[PDB]
Structures are given as structure tokens and as C-alpha cells.
Design an enzyme around this catalytic site. Structure first.
Site, short mmCIF file in Angstrom:
data_model
loop_
_atom_site.label_atom_id
_atom_site.label_comp_id
_atom_site.label_asym_id
_atom_site.label_seq_id
_atom_site.Cartn_x
_atom_site.Cartn_y
_atom_site.Cartn_z
N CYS A 49 0.84 -1.19 0.00
CA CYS A 49 0.00 0.00 0.00
C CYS A 49 0.89 1.25 0.00
CB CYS A 49 -0.96 -0.02 1.20
SG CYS A 49 -0.15 0.20 2.80
N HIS A 107 -10.41 2.50 2.46
CA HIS A 107 -9.30 3.44 2.60
C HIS A 107 -8.15 2.90 1.76
CE1 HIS A 107 -11.87 4.47 5.96
NE2 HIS A 107 -11.60 3.31 6.54
N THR A 108 -7.90 3.53 0.61
CA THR A 108 -6.88 3.03 -0.31
C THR A 108 -5.47 3.16 0.26
OG1 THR A 108 -6.60 5.14 -1.47
CG2 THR A 108 -8.39 3.70 -2.20
N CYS A 109 -5.29 3.92 1.34
CA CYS A 109 -3.96 4.09 1.91
C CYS A 109 -3.51 2.85 2.66
CB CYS A 109 -3.93 5.31 2.83
N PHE A 110 -4.43 2.14 3.31
CA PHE A 110 -4.09 0.99 4.15
C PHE A 110 -4.68 -0.32 3.64
CE2 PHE A 110 -3.26 3.62 8.23
CZ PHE A 110 -1.96 3.82 7.81
#
Length: 254
Positions: free
Chosen positions: A204, A227-230
């Protein structure tokens, strides 16, 4: 030009990009999830401002304090916007315009140049009827993703591997086609790139992270938020497989 010719030449490239890039390419307004991916702090502040009646104790001007080392030149987000404060009627306008001018403006010239290169190689009219998530699948390709590899290298939070909700979700993913699988992966992760090792070596924004499913702690009608960050999948509680699969399809199609 290279990307336009690659799509023209039916050629699959390794050119994976963010949502804002294709959204500006497709002239689609940038959503708040992109700012959430880059900074959860400003996303939290913006959603708190929008949800609550902050006009009572707002006392803010429309312009944002952006520093330039030597001196801060007040760059107005609109015409004579310094004299206009943030109100309840236009709180959505302020939030969306801050999201637009926080990242796109310092990249707007680059996107305009890319659009000039890309739109002279492909037809604007025939492609403008597509969405930003489909543009990544159009340029980088529509991969065939292994659900078995996905689930075998995935941890779950709030449930177990044998939990009924998790089993329903995996059944829905199994029934999801390459279209639906790719769009669901894009919703959950933010990219269409499939590592050669698969989900075992998935990474990620903040380093490596295997697929994780969190519990949304919400109602049955609540839609999952990713949540594309995690690579966090907030799977809420559901009552039946049909409602779960419809919610997942709505989330991926959007």
C-alpha cells in the site's frame, strides 16, 4: 501521446496512476476519497465540517493558508473570495473547491499537457462516456485476478475466516466477474496493478500490507467504505447474502 497510442495499439502498459489524474483527464470532479488517501487528517476535518453546523463558530475565510517560504501571497480560490466566509449553504462548495485546489492546481498544468498529448491520439467523444475507474482498466489492462490468492493471503478484523458475513463476501467476490473483481479491487486498493507474487506481496502507500477487512460497526443498510492508503475494507454487518452483494456492487460501480 504514448498512452493514447498504447490504447490505440491495443497494448497493455505498466502505467498505473491515481484517481485525480484520470478524473481530470475525464473532466470528472475529484472526490474526497483521494484527499483521504493522501491525508486522513484533512478528510476528517472536512467531513466533520460538512456533517455539523459549524457556521455558528466558523469564523473562517474562504482562502486557505498556503505558505511560500518568503511571503504568503493570498491566492483566492474564487473571485473576491477573501471577503466571502464559509457558510452552511456553500459548505459543500468550500470543501470541494479546497479539495480541488489543494492538489490539482499544483498539478493542473501537467494534467493539461497530458490531456493535450492523449486527446490528439484518441477520440474525445467516444471515451468521455467512461468513468475514472474504467480508465485505469482501459490503459493498464483489465487483469484476471485470483480470488483464491486474494482470500488465502488476507487477514480479517472483527470476524473470522469461517464467519458467515466473510463467507458471503467471498461468495460474492467469487460470483464477481473480471469486471466486478477488478472494480472491487480498485475500490478497496486504489490501483489495478496485480503483483506477480499476488496478494502475498501486496503493498500500500504506507509500505507493505496484506489485505485486511475491518468491521464498520454500522447498520445493515450501511455501505462499506474503503481506505486506499491501508487497503482496509470496512465490511459492515449484514442480514443476507443478497443485500451484501448488492451493496458491494453499488460500491464498486458507484
Amino acid at each position: 501521446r504514448i498512452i493514447g497510442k498504447a490504447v490505440y495499439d491495443e497494448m497493455t502498459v505498466d502505467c498505473h496512476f491515481t484517481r485525480a489524474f484520470y478524473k481530470r483527464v475525464l473532466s470528472i470532479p475529484v472526490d474526497l476519497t483521494d484527499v483521504e488517501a493522501l491525508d486522513p487528517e484533512f478528510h476528517r476535518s472536512l467531513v466533520w465540517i460538512l456533517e455539523n453546523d459549524i457556521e455558528n463558530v466558523l469564523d473562517m475565510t474562504f482562502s486557505i493558508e498556503q505558505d511560500r517560504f518568503g511571503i504568503t501571497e493570498i491566492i483566492d480560490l474564487k473571485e473576491n473570495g477573501r471577503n466571502i466566509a464559509v457558510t452552511n449553504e456553500n459548505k459543500r462548495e468550500y470543501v470541494e473547491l479546497v479539495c480541488r485546489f489543494k492538489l490539482v492546481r499544483v498539478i493542473e498544468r501537467q494534467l493539461s499537457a497530458f490531456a493535450e498529448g492523449f486527446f490528439e491520439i484518441l477520440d474525445v467523444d467516444m471515451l468521455k462516456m467512461f468513468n475514472e475507474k474504467e480508465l485505469e482498466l482501459l490503459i493498464s489492462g483489465l487483469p484476471e485476478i485470483d480470488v483464491d490468492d486474494w482470500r488465502n493471503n488476507t487477514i480479517y478484523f472483527g470476524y473470522t475466516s469461517d464467519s458467515q458475513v466473510i463467507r458471503w463476501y467471498w461468495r460474492a467476490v467469487r460470483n464477481f466477474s473480471m469486471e466486478e473483481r477488478a472494480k472491487l479491487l480498485q475500490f478497496a486498493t486504489g490501483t489495478s496493478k496485480l503483483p506477480l507474487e499476488g496478494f502475498a506481496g501486496l503493498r500500500c502507500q504506507n509500505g507493505n500490507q496484506k489485505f485486511q477487512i475491518h468491521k464498520a460497526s454500522g447498520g445493515s443498510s450501511r455501505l462499506p467504505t474503503a481506505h486506499t492508503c491501508f487497503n482496509q475494507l470496512d465490511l459492515p454487518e449484514y442480514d443476507s447474502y443478497e443485500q451484501l452483494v448488492k451493496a458491494l456492487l453499488f460500491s464498486l460501480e458507484e
